[PDB]
Amino acid sequence: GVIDTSAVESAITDGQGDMKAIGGYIVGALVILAVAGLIYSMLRKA
Amino acid sequence: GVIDTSAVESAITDGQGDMKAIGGYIVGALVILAVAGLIYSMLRKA
Amino acid sequence: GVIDTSAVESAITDGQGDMKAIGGYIVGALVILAVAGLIYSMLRKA
Amino acid sequence: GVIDTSAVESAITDGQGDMKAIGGYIVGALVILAVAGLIYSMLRKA
Amino acid sequence: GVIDTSAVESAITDGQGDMKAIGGYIVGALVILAVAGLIYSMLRKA
Amino acid sequence: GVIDTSAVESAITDGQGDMKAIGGYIVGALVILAVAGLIYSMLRKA
Amino acid sequence: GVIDTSAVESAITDGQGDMKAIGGYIVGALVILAVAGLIYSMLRKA
Amino acid sequence: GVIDTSAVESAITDGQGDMKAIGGYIVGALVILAVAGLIYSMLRKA
Amino acid sequence: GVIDTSAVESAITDGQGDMKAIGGYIVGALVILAVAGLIYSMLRKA
Amino acid sequence: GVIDTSAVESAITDGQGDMKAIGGYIVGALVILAVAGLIYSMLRKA
Amino acid sequence: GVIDTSAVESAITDGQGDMKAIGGYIVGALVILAVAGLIYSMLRKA
Amino acid sequence: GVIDTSAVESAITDGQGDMKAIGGYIVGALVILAVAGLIYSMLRKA
């Protein structure tokens, strides 16, 4: 009496493979305010 | 069952390319108070 | 058996075109406290 | 399906025009401790 | 088949006219710690 | 459809009248290290 | 068709009378780091 | 409708009685660099 | 034609007497991060 | 009509007994930068 | 007229035994930003 | 009635092994402004 849920794992494993894609696109934008955070500290201490 | 997230990386890679633009516009204004910080020290020691 | 959702994309693409308008009106007000943040530092160091 | 956001830019452009007003009222009070900072140095060196 | 929403704008335009009243009562209390913030700096530098 | 906010201004105008009281109690303690700062300079120069 | 809300004001006026009690217990602990903040400044200037 | 806050004043009056303990342990270490600051001045003037 | 609701007030007055019991068990755990919040401030200022 | 909440106080009194354990492990690490803060001041004044 | 709920406690006591497992896996990742939070403070004070 | 959480510890132990990697990449950049902080002090004292 089953219902075919084969279209579930095919849909959301491709879903969770897309959460990883837009996680790496944020990490690449948070290191901008990490690098610029501490080369401001070099100019101030000088 | 995917949703097209192709408009994400096209939107925020151009976003993080703009954080770099206004980071270099601050560094050019912090060296003003680095140079003027230590040519004041030459006049005082004289 | 469809329902005409043509009035959806006509309504919210004009919606997301208005989020961009009031995003640029905030950026123009946050640079006021960025510029005035570091010309206070010039007067203090003098 | 828009919502009239015409009352937004009319409200905060007049808002950011007021941040400039109270920025210039602080600069006029930080030059007091810049001028008095270095006419104390004239009396001490004498 | 409308429902009279005339009691809405009469109720919340008088509501948002009261948010402005208690916004100006806070600004009058944040300038106390702005003025006293920098007449402490005059006594310390002396 | 208002809510009585008459207990707000009665509560925080008496609040900001108390920030002024403990601001003047600090100024009376910072002039101790201003006066003693420069009658030490008289004894050293002698 | 009312519901007796007489147990409301009896419960939260005694509630807001207790927020005042633990506000005064914090003020008595923030003046410790205000007094000790500026008798450290007397020892350093000496 | 109260909540027993009797465990508050029993917890932080013993808390603020401990801020006083580690304030007096710092004052005993700042007088070391006050005494040694001005018996260096006796050796230099000799 | 009533239905005996005498088992209601006997069940939920003992219910609301138990909400007070686990409210006082949280207040005893929030004062831990209130006391430790400001004896960290004594060590940093020293 | 009660629900047995005897597993509550047994769970969070052991919870708040663990907040005290990791509070004392931080105090032991903030005195490192208190002691080293003022034996740097002895070397500089010498 | 009962219904066998013996499969309930066998299912959720093993459920709450798994909430404890992934609670300890978070605590092991929050101490990374506690240790690195205050060995940054040693390098800055030096 | 369990749910397989074996993919949890495999995912976040590799997660917390990556927090350590980018902690050591910051420590290597804070010692730059520690070394340069005190070879500036040698040039000034000379």
Residue numbers in the entry:
A (entry chain A), B (entry chain A), C (entry chain A), D (entry chain A), E (entry chain A), F (entry chain A), ...: 1 to 46
Please quote the paper that reports this structure.
Pf4 and other Pf phages are members of the Inoviridae family which have recently been shown to be pervasive across all prokaryotes. Inoviruses are filamentous and rod-shaped, roughly six nm in diameter, that contain a single-stranded DNA (ssDNA) genome. The CoaB subunits adopt a 77-Å-long, α-helical structure, with the C-termini pointed toward the core of the phage and the N-termini directed toward the outside of the cylindrical filament.
All side-chain densities for the 46-residue mature coat protein B (CoaB) of Pf4 are unambiguously assigned in our map. Pf4 filaments show a rise and rotation per subunit of 3.14 Å and 65.90°, respectively, allowing multiple CoaB molecules to pack tightly around the filament axis in an interdigitated array. The structure shows that Pf4 filaments have a diameter of ∼62 Å and an inner cavity with a diameter of ∼22 Å. Density for the ssDNA genome inside the 22-Å cavity in the core of the Pf4 phage is clearly resolved. Unexpectedly, this density shows that the Pf4 ssDNA genome is linear, rather than circular ssDNA, which was the expected paradigm for members of the Inoviridae family, since it was proposed for the related bacteriophage Pf1 (10) as well as fd. Clear density for the phosphate backbone of the ssDNA genome is resolved, but no density for a second antiparallel phosphate backbone is observed, as would be expected for circular ssDNA. The pitch of the linear ssDNA is 15.7 Å, meaning that there is exactly one CoaB protein for every base of ssDNA in the phage genome. Analysis of the interaction between CoaB protein subunits and the linear ssDNA genome (in the Pf4 structure with ssDNA) shows weak contacts between arginine 44 residues and the phosphate backbone of the DNA. The capsid coat itself is comparatively tightly packed, and is maintained by several hydrophobic interactions between the CoaB subunits, which repeat along the filament, likely providing large net stability to the phage structure.
